Amino acid sequence: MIQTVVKRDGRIVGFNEQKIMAAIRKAMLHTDKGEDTTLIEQITDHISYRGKSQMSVEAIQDAIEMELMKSARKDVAQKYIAYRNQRNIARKAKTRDVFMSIVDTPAGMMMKFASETTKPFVDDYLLSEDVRDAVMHNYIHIHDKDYYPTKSLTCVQHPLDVILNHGFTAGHGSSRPAKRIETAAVLACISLETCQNEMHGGQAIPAFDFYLAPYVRMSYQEEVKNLEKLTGEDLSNLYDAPIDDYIEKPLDGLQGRERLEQHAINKTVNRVHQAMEAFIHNMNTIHSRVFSSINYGTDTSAEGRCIMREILQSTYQGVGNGETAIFPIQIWKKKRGVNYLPEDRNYDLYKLACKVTARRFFPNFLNLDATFNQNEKWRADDPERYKWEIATMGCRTRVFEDRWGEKTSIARGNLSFSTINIVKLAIECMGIENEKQRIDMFFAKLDNILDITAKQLDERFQFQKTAMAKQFPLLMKYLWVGAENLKPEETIESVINHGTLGIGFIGLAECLVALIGKHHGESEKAQELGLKIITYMRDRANEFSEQYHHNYSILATPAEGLSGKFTKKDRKQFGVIPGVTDRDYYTNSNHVPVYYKCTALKKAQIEAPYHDLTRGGHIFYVEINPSVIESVVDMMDKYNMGYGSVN
Amino acid sequence: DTPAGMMMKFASETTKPFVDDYLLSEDVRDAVMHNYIHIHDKDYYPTKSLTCVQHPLDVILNHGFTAGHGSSRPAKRIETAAVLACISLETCQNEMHGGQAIPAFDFYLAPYVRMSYQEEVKNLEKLTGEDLSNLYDAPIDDYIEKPLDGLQGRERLEQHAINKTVNRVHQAMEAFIHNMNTIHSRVFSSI
Amino acid sequence: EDRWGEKTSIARGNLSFSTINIVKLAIECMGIENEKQRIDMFFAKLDNILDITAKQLDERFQFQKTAMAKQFPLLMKYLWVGAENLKPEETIESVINHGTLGIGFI
Ligand SMILES: Nc1ncnc2c1ncn2[C@H]1C[C@H](O)[C@@H](COP(=O)(O)OP(=O)(O)OP(=O)(O)O)O1
Ligand SMILES: Nc1ncnc2c1ncn2[C@H]1C[C@H](O)[C@@H](COP(=O)(O)OP(=O)(O)OP(=O)(O)O)O1
Ligand SMILES: Nc1ncnc2c1ncn2[C@H]1C[C@H](O)[C@@H](COP(=O)(O)OP(=O)(O)OP(=O)(O)O)O1
Ligand SMILES: Nc1ncnc2c1ncn2[C@H]1C[C@H](O)[C@@H](COP(=O)(O)OP(=O)(O)OP(=O)(O)O)O1
Ligand SMILES: [Mg+2]
Ligand SMILES: [Mg+2]
C-alpha cells in the first residue's frame, strides 16, 4: 500500500483515503448526472495498491486522471483536467509572469497588455491579403503596429511661439501668456509632454533660441524697475539700452548709477540660469516616470547667447550629484558664416560646446551647409531666419522638401514608416552559381517587395485620414500648419498631406556577402553594388511619389525595435551560413560592421555617398580631449556628411 | 478618443476575465456574477497596487530622491519646493490607482518663506554695503504688504524684503494651482 | 527577534511552553525493517504531534488574554513592553503579543 505522501511544500504526511474520495466527488457533482461511491471505491482501491511506499501529490493526481480516462464516465475527467490546470496557473502567478505567456511597474504592465491585445487584430482584420502574406514570411516590418487602430502620427516640430504669445486651452485647463523666463520654459515643457499622449513617437522644439529670446529682456526690465522703486531715481533709459552680452563680473569697484546697472544684469543672469537646469531636470525625470529634442546654435543676438551659455553650463555640470542626464537630447547647428570660422560671431560658444560634448556626449552635430540642406531664402538680416533652417529629431528623421508646399521643417511631421528585409532575398537567391543571374534575380525581387511596401504605406495613409480634430486637442489646434482653420468636428484630410512616408533598410553588409565574398568596407567592387541598389530604391521612391500623390523617402532605421527580430527567424529557416547568419545582429542600415577593424577616415569615405542618397534619415556614428571632436566635425564638413553623433 | 484612452480600455478589458476565472474562489465569483459584490478597481488585480496615500513631504524636501535614472537635490527656495511636491505627487500616481493628498500643507511649506526672506536681504547687501545681519533671524509678526512711501534709511531697506518675498510666494502658489489643473492631458490631488 | 517590533530583550518574556516526547515515536517505528520506510513514518507522526502542540499553545494564549491588568499589579503598570497605556479594567489583549511561545524536545 501507500503510507507516506510528500506535500508540495515539502512536508511528509500519512496516507488518508478520505481525500482522494472527496475530490472526485466534487468533480462529479457538476456533470449533469452525479454518481455515488460505486466508482469512487474502485478508483481509490486501484490507486492505493499498485503504488510504492511513498508518493507525491502530483503523481497521485496523474493516477487519478489516468484512471478517470479509462472508464465509462469520461465527462468527469474533462472537468478535472481543467480545474487542475487553472489552479496550477493560479499558484504559479505568485512568483512569475504567467499572465503574459497566454497572450514591472503597474503602468508598464498595463501597456504590455494593451499592445499584445491590439497587435493580432490589426494583423488579421485591417491589412490586406498580399500585405499580410508578405509580413508573415518575414519580408517587411511595420513599425509601431500596436497603435494602428488609433489613427496616430509619428512626430512633429513645435511652433512654440503660437502658445507663448497667446493663451492655450485644452480640456478644462487654460493658460495665459508668459511674462518672464521662469514661466516660459515651464510652458515649453508642458506643451512638449502634453502632445506625447497624442502621438506615438518623439518630440522636438526647434529654434530654442529665438522663441525664448524675447524673454531675457522682460526680466531685465522688471529687475530695473525694482532697483529704481526704492532709489527714487528715474532710470527710464535703461529699458531698451543696447547691450553687448549678458556677462557677469564682480561688482565692487564702482559707484553711483554705474553700480545699479551691473547688479541688475547679475540678478537677471542668475534668474535665467536656474530656469534652464530646472528644464533639464524636468525632462530627465519625466522619462523614467517621453522622447524629446531641442535645437539651437544660430542666433547672433545678446539674449540668444545668454540662453545658449546657460544651457551649456547646466548640461556640462550634470544632474543630481553629477550624473549625466539622458534627456533632453540636444543638437548643435553648424553654419559657415555664423559660428564656424574664428572670425565668426559665435566661435566661443562652439568651443564650449565641443568641451561639453567631449564629456557628457551631448550635443550632437548637424551640418547646416550640406549640399542637400541649403535653402535659397535664408537672409541674415531678417528677424525670422529660423523658418529656413533644417531641424532634426532624436530618431534621425528629416522633413525638409515638399512637392506642394514650402521648404521648411516647422509644424511638420512624419506619419509612418516600414523597414524592408534584404538579407533574406540575397540568401534565397544564393542558389545559382553564375554571378550575373544572381544580381538579375535580386533586382527582380526587390521591385516586387518595394511595390508591396508602398501599397502598405498608402493604405496606412488612407486609414489615418478621417480622424476628427477633437481626437488631438493640441496638435490640431496650435501645432500644425493648417490649424486655426479647422472646426472641432472636421476631418483633417485637408492638411494631412504636409507629411512624410519612409521606407527603411537594415543590414546591407550581409546582403553583399550573400552575393560576393566581401562586404562594402573590404573590396572596391563591393561598394559599386551598394550604391546601385540604394539608387534603385531612391528612383522607385520618386516613381511612387509621382504615382500616389504623396512624399516618399529612403531611411536608415534607428535600430530600436528591430535589432534581432530578423536574424533569429532566418537562422531557423535556412540555418547557419558563414558571415551572414552567425552573429545575432544583422548590421545597421549601411554602416561598416562593428566587428571589422577600421579607422574614422575610411568609414567616412565609404559612408558619405549613402548620406547623400538617404534623404529620410541618416547618421554617422563613431566611438572614441575637446580637440578630438574637432576632427569629427571637420570630417563632416569635408564631405557631404549631414548628421554626426560621435560620443 | 485620445490614443491613451483607447489603450487603457483595451488593457482593462483584457485583464478582467483572467481575474474572474483564475484568481477567485467559487463563492466570490458567484457573488460577483449575481450582482451582490462589486470589487473596486478589479482591472488592476494582477498589478498588486494600493489606492490612496498621505505624503510625508519632509523626506522629499530635505533630502532629494533617486528614481530610475533621475535625481534631485534639497530644495532651498519656495519656487523649487512646490515643484518637487508636484513631481512627487505625479510620480507616485503611476504606481497606484487612487488619489494623492498632502496633509498640513502649511507646516510643510512654512520653512522656505524664511529662506527666501534671507536670500532677498543678502541681495541688498551687495548693493549698499552694510551689515543688515540683525534681520536674518529678526522676529516677523506678519508679512503684510503696504506701500513703500514715507520711509528712509535702514527701515526702508527692510520693508523692501517683505515686499519682494510676498510676490515670489504668490507666483509659486498660482503656478502650483495651474499645474495641478492641467493634468487633463499631461490625477486626483488634495491639500 | 520579533515580527511586530524591534530587536530588544527588555520588558519582554515568555508566555508558556510545552515539551514534545520524541523517543516514543522512534520506539513505535521499530517494527519496520526497510531502513528507509522506518525513517519516514517518524516524520509522519512528528508532523501531527507538532500540529496539535501548536494548537494547544494557541488555545492557552487565547485563554491568557481576558486577564484584567489589575490582577498583575507591578507588571501591567511599570514592567512590560508598554503597559503605561492600560487601565485597571482594560484587558491586556493589545500588548500580550510581544512575548514568545516555545516548543522543546528531549
Ligand atoms: N492525505 C492524503 N492522502 C492521499 N492523497 C492525498 C492526501 N492529501 C492530498 N492528497 C492528494 C490526492 C488528492 O487528489 C489531491 C488533492 O488534495 P487536496 O486536499 O485538494 O490538496 P492539498 O492536500 O494539497 O491541500 P488543500 O486542503 O489546500 O487542498 O492531493
Ligand atoms: N469546481 C470544481 N470543478 C471540478 N473539479 C473540481 C472542482 N473543485 C475541485 N475539483 C477537483 C479537481 C481538483 O484537482 C481537486 C482538488 O480541488 P481543490 O482542493 O480545490 O484544489 P487544489 O488542492 O489542487 O488547489 P489549491 O491550489 O487551492 O490547493 O478537486
Ligand atoms: N506649471 C504651470 N503650468 C501651467 N500654467 C502655469 C504654470 N505656472 C504658471 N502657469 C500659468 C500662470 C499664468 O496663467 C501663465 C503664466 O503667466 P506669467 O507670465 O508667468 O504671469 P502672469 O500673467 O500670471 O502674471 P501677472 O500676475 O503679472 O499678471 O501660466
Ligand atoms: N521643475 C523641476 N523638475 C524637476 N526637478 C526640479 C525642478 N525644479 C527644481 N528641481 C530640482 C533640481 C535641483 O536639484 C533641486 C533643488 O533646486 P534648487 O533649490 O535650485 O537648488 P540648487 O542646488 O540649484 O541651489 P542654489 O544654486 O541656490 O545653491 O530641485
Ligand atoms: Mg538652483
Ligand atoms: Mg503671474
Residue numbers in the entry:
A (entry chain B): 1 to 103, 120 to 305, 311 to 645, 652 to 674
B (entry chain A): 120 to 305, 311 to 315
C (entry chain C): 422 to 527
Question: What do the study's own words say?
Answer:
RNRs produce all four deoxyribonucleotides and are the only enzymes providing de novo building blocks for DNA replication and repair in all free-living organisms. Class III RNRs, which only function anaerobically, are dimers of an α subunit (NrdD) with a stable radical close to the active site, and binding sites for allosteric nucleotides. Binding of ATP activates RNR, and binding of dATP inhibits it. Here, we present structural, biochemical, and biophysical studies on the ATP-cone-containing NrdD from the human pathogen Prevotella copri, showing that the binding of dATP causes increased flexibility of the C-terminal glycyl radical-bearing domain, as well as a flap-like loop that binds across the top of the active site in the active form.
From the same micrographs that revealed the dATP-bound dimers we also resolved dATP-bound tetramers. We obtained a map from cryoSPARC at 2.8 Å, which was again improved with DeepEMhancer. Two dATP molecules are bound to each ATP-cone and one at each of the specificity sites, giving a total of 12 visible dATPs per tetramer. The tetramer reveals an arrangement of two dimers (chains A/B and C/D, respectively) in which the ATP-cones are all well-ordered and one ATP-cone from each pair mediates interactions between the dimers. The ATP-cones have an almost domain-swapped arrangement within each dimer relative to the core domains. Remarkably, the pair of ATP-cones is highly asymmetrically positioned with respect to the twofold axis of its core dimer, being displaced as a rigid body towards the other dimer. The asymmetric arrangement is associated with two distinct conformations of the linker 93–103 between the fourth helix of the ATP-cone and the core domain. The rest of the polypeptide between residues 103 and 121, including the NxN flap, is disordered in both linkers. Interestingly, all contacts between the two dimers of the tetramer are mediated by interactions between one of the ATP-cones in one dimer (B or D) and one of the core domains of the other dimer (C or A, respectively). The amount of buried surface area is small: 717 Å2, or around 1% of the total surface area of each dimer.
